[PDB]
Amino acid sequence: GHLDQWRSRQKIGMGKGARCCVICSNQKALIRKYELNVCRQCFRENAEHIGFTKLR
Amino acid sequence: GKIRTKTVKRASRQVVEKYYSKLNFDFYQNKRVIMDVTIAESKKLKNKIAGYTTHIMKRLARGPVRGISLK
Amino acid sequence: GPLSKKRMIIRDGVFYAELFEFLKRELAEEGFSGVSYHVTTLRTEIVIKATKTREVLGVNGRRIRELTACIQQRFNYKEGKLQLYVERVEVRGLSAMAQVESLRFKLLSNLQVRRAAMGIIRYVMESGAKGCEVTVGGKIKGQRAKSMTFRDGYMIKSGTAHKSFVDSACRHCYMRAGCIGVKVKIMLPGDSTGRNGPSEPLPDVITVIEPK
Amino acid sequence: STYVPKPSRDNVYRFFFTEGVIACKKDRMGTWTGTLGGNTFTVPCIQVMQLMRSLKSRNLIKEQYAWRHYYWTLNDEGIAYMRSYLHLAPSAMPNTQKP
Amino acid sequence: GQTVRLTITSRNAKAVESVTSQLLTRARDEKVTIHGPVRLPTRTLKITTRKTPCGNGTNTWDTFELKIYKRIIDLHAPTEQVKKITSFTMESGVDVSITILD
RNA sequence: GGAACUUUACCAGAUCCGGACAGGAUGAGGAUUGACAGAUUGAGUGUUCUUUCUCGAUUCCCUGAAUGGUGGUGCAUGGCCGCUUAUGGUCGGUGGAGUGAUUUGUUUGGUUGAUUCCGUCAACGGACGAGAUCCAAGCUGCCCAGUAGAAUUCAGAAUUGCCCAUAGGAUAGCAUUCGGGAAUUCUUCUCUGCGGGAUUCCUUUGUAUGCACAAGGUGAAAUUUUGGGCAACAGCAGGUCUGUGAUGCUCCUCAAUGUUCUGGGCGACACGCGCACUACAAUGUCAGUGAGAACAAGAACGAACCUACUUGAUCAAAAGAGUGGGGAAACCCCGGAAUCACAUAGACCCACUUGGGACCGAGGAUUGCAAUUAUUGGUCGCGCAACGAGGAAUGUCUCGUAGGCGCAGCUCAUCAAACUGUGCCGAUUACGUCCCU
Numbered sequence: 021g022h023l024d025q026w027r028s029r030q031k032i033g034m035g036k037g038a039r040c041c042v043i044c045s046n047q048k049a050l051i052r053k054y055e056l057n058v059c060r061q062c063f064r065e066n067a068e069h070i071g072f073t074k075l076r
Numbered sequence: 077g078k079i080r081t082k083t084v085k086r087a088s089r090q091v092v093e094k095y096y097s098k099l100n101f102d103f104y105q106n107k108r109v110i111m112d113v114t115i116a117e118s119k120k121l122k123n124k125i126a127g128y129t130t131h132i133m134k135r136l137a138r139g140p141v142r143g144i145s146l147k
Numbered sequence: 148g149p150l151s152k153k154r155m156i157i158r159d160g161v162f163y164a165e166l167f168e169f170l171k172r173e174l175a176e177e178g179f180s181g182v183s184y185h186v187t188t189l190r191t192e193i194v195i196k197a198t199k200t201r202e203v204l205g206v207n208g209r210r211i212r213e214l215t216a217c218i219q220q221r222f223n224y225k226e227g228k229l230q231l232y233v234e235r236v237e238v239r240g241l242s243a244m245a246q247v248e249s250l251r252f253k254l255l256s257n258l259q260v261r262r263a264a265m266g267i268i269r270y271v272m273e274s275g276a277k278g279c280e281v282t283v284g285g286k287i288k289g290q291r292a293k294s295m296t297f298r299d300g301y302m303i304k305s306g307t308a309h310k311s312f313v314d315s316a317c318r319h320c321y322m323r324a325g326c327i328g329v330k331v332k333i334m335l336p337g338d339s340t341g342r343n344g345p346s347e348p349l350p351d352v353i354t355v356i357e358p359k
Numbered sequence: 360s361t362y363v364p365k366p367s368r369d370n371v372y373r374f375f376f377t378e379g380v381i382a383c384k385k386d387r388m389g390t391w392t393g394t395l396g397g398n399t400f401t402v403p404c405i406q407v408m409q410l411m412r413s414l415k416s417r418n419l420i421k422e423q424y425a426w427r428h429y430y431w432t433l434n435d436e437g438i439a440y441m442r443s444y445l446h447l448a449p450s451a452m453p454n455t456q457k458p
Numbered sequence: 459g460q461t462v463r464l465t466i467t468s469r470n471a472k473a474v475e476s477v478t479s480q481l482l483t484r485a486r487d488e489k490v491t492i493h494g495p496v497r498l499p500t501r502t503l504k505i506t507t508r509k510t511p512c513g514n515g516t517n518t519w520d521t522f523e524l525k526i527y528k529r530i531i532d533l534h535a536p537t538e539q540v541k542k543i544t545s546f547t548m549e550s551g552v553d554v555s556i557t558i559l560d
Numbered sequence: 561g562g563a564a565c566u567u568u569a570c571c572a573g574a575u576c577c578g579g580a581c582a583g584g585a586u587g588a589g590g591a592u593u594g595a596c597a598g599a600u601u602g603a604g605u606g607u608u609c610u611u612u613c614u615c616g617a618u619u620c621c622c623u624g625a626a627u628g629g630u631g632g633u634g635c636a637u638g639g640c641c642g643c644u645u646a647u648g649g650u651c652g653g654u655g656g657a658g659u660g661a662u663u664u665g666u667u668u669g670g671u672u673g674a675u676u677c678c679g680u681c682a683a684c685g686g687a688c689g690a691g692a693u694c695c696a697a698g699c700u701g702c703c704c705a706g707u708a709g710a711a712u713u714c715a716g717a718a719u720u721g722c723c724c725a726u727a728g729g730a731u732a733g734c735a736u737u738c739g740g741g742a743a744u745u746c747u748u749c750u751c752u753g754c755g756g757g758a759u760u761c762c763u764u765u766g767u768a769u770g771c772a773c774a775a776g777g778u779g780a781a782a783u784u785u786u787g788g789g790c791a792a793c794a795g796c797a798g799g800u801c802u803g804u805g806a807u808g809c810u811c812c813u814c815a816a817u818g819u820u821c822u823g824g825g826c827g828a829c830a831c832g833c834g835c836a837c838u839a840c841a842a843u844g845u846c847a848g849u850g851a852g853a854a855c856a857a858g859a860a861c862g863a864a865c866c867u868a869c870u871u872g873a874u875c876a877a878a879a880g881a882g883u884g885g886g887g888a889a890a891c892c893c894c895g896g897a898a899u900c901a902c903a904u905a906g907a908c909c910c911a912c913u914u915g916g917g918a919c920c921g922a923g924g925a926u927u928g929c930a931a932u933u934a935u936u937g938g939u940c941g942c943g944c945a946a947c948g949a950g951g952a953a954u955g956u957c958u959c960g961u962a963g964g965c966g967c968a969g970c971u972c973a974u975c976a977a978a979c980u981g982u983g984c985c986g987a988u989u990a991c992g993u994c995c996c997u
């Protein structure tokens with residue numbers, strides 16, 4: 021019955037533990053705005069390529 | 077707090093040297109001339125150049141000035 | 148359901164960022180300098196900028212076809228909806244990505260930091276750059292890391308005109324003692340076309356026109 | 360479960376030979392879908408990861424990784440091994456190699 | 459007759475203006491009635507993140523902005539004519555969508 | 561970094577291999593995989609066992625390896641960030657001085673936020689930084705509207721003139737209105753890509769050559785226009801190995817520091833400190849009425865996401881249910897925010913009081929797989945908990961600013977006393993100095 025028990029709580033897919041950065045798979049400091057799903061550090065690294073720019 | 081930096085002053089001296097006969101004591105006509113005869117990405121810089129160019133013309137009325145050479 | 152225009156812009160930006168990272172990792176050995184994609188209803192056009200065009204193509208376009216297959220499978224592009232082109236960079240010495248890759252390759256050959264950086268700078272200035280700046284940092288002389296910078300010509304650091312007159316690239320170069328960082332910044336000259344450089348004069352330069 | 364049923368391995372190898380590359384998202388939980396002569400077939404991503412790990416350790420594929428996705432590519436010896444494994448004709452060629 | 463609306467959206471102001479101008483010229487060559495172009499409100503996408511990785515030092519922030527420009531043009535032309543007008547090499551990063559109004 | 565599970569790194573247990581590959585042992589006469597029932601167990605968990613099946617060469621065992629790790633070391637590193645350091649700072653070439661370290665330039669006078677300028681000059685020339693550039697506000701031009709509006713013309717419908725309240729003071733006029741229908745006409749208001757506009761420009765004073773300054777004018781705007789962003793060179797053993805498939809070297813590696821699953825913990829206190837929120841009341845608290853913002857967000861054949869309307873309702877709230885709309889200038893939405901206003905002829909009348917709302921009791925509903933006030937609303941109780949303006953000390957701030965007030969986004973299945981923005985009401989004081997730092 022271990023195949024059913026294995027990752028059964030991750031089957032539910034709810035909470036901070038079910039979403040990860042689409043670049044680095046880290047589950048901390050995620051940006052959900054506009055469904056970006058990028059952690060803030062990776063977002064700072066990749067923002068120019070994504071299209072954002074530092075103004076104001 | 078409105079000092080003219082060396083960029084503005086150097087540009088104005090060049091403008092007065094090259095285009096003396098097209099300038100007068102009026103800021104606005106001098107501004108039009110300077111927009112015609114200079115290249116710059118900055119409108120504010122051109123305005124400052126026109127202001128100092130008019131100042132230089134007013135001084136050149138009352139005797140010669142240092143850094144300007146005309147025939 | 149159709150996605151909102153805000154969502155569409157975000158999705159397109161994320162796609163471009165991922166494609167750039169994938170091509171940067173895949174074509175690190177070649178002079179990968181950028182990617183530009185054009186989308187139409189007919190199909191999607193992807194143009195790869197590289198220095199060693201033959202290696203990016205491979206024999207009979209084997210490498211380019213493998214890259215096309217990778218992109219097609221990852222983004223689920225249907226058959227015939229994706230096409231990849233490879234064009235060479237006009238002036239290699241003005242591309243910071245190409246020069247950081249060149250500096251990295253010279254470093255991996257156990258070359259001295261000063262020697263390789265000076266060669267990079269000399270080649271960049273020979274290609275007609277306004278200036279150049281190469282920074283190498285890490286465990287160069289021993290356990291105590293130090294950061295060395297080599298400069299030539301002139302460079303602009305402040306304002307936002309440095310984002311358009313200067314191009315920069317940085318990489319981690321891996322060695323046996325650990326990580327080495329390599330940075331190259333090239334002050335681009337003025338070209339009226341805009342293919343290279345920003346094509347407008349510097350923001351603090353006033354040129355007086357000679358009369359007739 | 361990394362127990363790979365043999366037909367799943369055969370389908371993965373056939374798709375790998377036909378389309379010279381395979382791209383798979385790196386998630387322990389998930390399903391990878393490929394197309395073989397129309398239709399589809401689905402094998403868990405953990406089993407694809409296991410098969411490609413075995414192939415990589417045997418110096419038969421090149422590996423790349425970016426943004427939660429793998430990119431595996433059959434090299435020359437990997438191509439020869441695939442041809443011997445599926446008993447394809449000596450004229451059998453991947454799509455990226457066919458003109 | 460029937461109205462056809464082109465919705466031109468992009469994140470590059472120069473590109474969106476260039477495409478809008480080219481469409482305007484092409485439509486004027488076809489001698490068709492034109493409504494617009496209307497410059498729709500510009501939307502700004504804002505992401506404000508801490509600058510530091512980890513959490514040390516003065517809490518300084520980065521404000522990343524992404525601006526979206528949208529234009530709409532109404533053509534009193536058949537679908538074939540509108541398809542002809544939009545058949546040209548479009549600037550990259552510009553999305554042109556065709557819609558029939560009621 | 562607002563942690564119920566997850567996250568999670570900690571604790572008590574139990575699983576899996578996610579030990580690739582290579583060399584040997586066994587092995588279709590079956591290497592192995594997965595399990596019914598009983599029992600072992602926290603586990604109607606083949607974890608292991610009994611007893612029976614089922615798969616099929618994928619795997620097991622055993623040696624070297626390998627892999628993964630929010631393991632260590634940030635005093636081995638990369639990248640980034642903070643700080644020195646908000647100020648005006650920095651460094652070559654050639655020349656000059658010196659045996660040299662070094663120095664001059666780059667000092668001095670006036671001016672400027674400014675190593676900003678003028679002047680002088682053993683320097684002359686250059687390079688950065690400052691300035692310029694960039695982004696938002698304010699004024700404005702061309703464009704432009706069937707996702708913004710307006711005005712007129714026909715309609716249709718409503719009030720309609722002896723009227724003066726419980727007494728109804730003061731405050732303009734001497735035919736009007738109806739976002740529950742058409743028709744033209746137009747761009748004042750809204751939308752915006754590129755432009756214009758301000759510069760010490762004009763006039764006086766003191767400076768008195770210049771560089772400037774102060775008052776006033778012109779003006780939407782009068783001095784870095786206002787607010788931001790960017791920001792040199794040197795360093796710090798400053799932070800981060802808990803962002804990453806960034807990493808050297810080290811530690812663990814099958815009863816694991818890998819990975820899952822179960823249950824706890826990160827929240828425990830007669831304790832101390834930092835940052836908030838709510839108050840101590842009458843310039844108020846209650847009940848009513850009025851007029852009225854701005855940034856914003858909305859979902860993955862349909863289905864998530866956000867909403868309006870209706871209903872529930874022949875009788876509390878919170879709910880629960882339908883029918884629609886919205887991919888967002890289109891629906892929400894004429895965005896009825898709270899500060900606020902009210903000649904409401906309302907209650908309270910100086911008290912720990914109708915101030916305060918801590919603590920706690922009982923019903924009920926909702927999110928979620930899982931919630932005993934430690935999810936979170938709502939109802940009635942409790943209020944007899946301090947608290948009546950706060951010692952030594954101490955923070956921030958000069959104009960649409962402080963303060964006050966809400967709103968949105970972000971976290972987010974559920975939960976803002978937080979942060980990031982927004983608009984609303986809107987001052988006192990100074991326009992100085994080097995006493996303190």
Ligand SMILES: [Mg+2]
Pocket residue numbers: 305306
């Ligand atoms: Mg600046």
Ligand SMILES: [Mg+2]
Pocket residue numbers: none
């Ligand atoms: Mg746990």
Ligand SMILES: [Mg+2]
Pocket residue numbers: 634797
């Ligand atoms: Mg350190």
Ligand SMILES: [Mg+2]
Pocket residue numbers: 634
């Ligand atoms: Mg560091």
Ligand SMILES: [Mg+2]
Pocket residue numbers: none
């Ligand atoms: Mg010397």
Ligand SMILES: [Mg+2]
Pocket residue numbers: none
């Ligand atoms: Mg010298």
Ligand SMILES: [Mg+2]
Pocket residue numbers: none
């Ligand atoms: Mg010196």
Ligand SMILES: [Mg+2]
Pocket residue numbers: 797
């Ligand atoms: Mg330290």
Ligand SMILES: [Mg+2]
Pocket residue numbers: none
């Ligand atoms: Mg672990």
Ligand SMILES: [Mg+2]
Pocket residue numbers: none
């Ligand atoms: Mg009381």
Ligand SMILES: [Mg+2]
Pocket residue numbers: none
């Ligand atoms: Mg009360």
Ligand SMILES: [Mg+2]
Pocket residue numbers: 562978
């Ligand atoms: Mg918080």
Ligand code: NA
Pocket residue numbers: none
């Ligand atoms: Na109560």
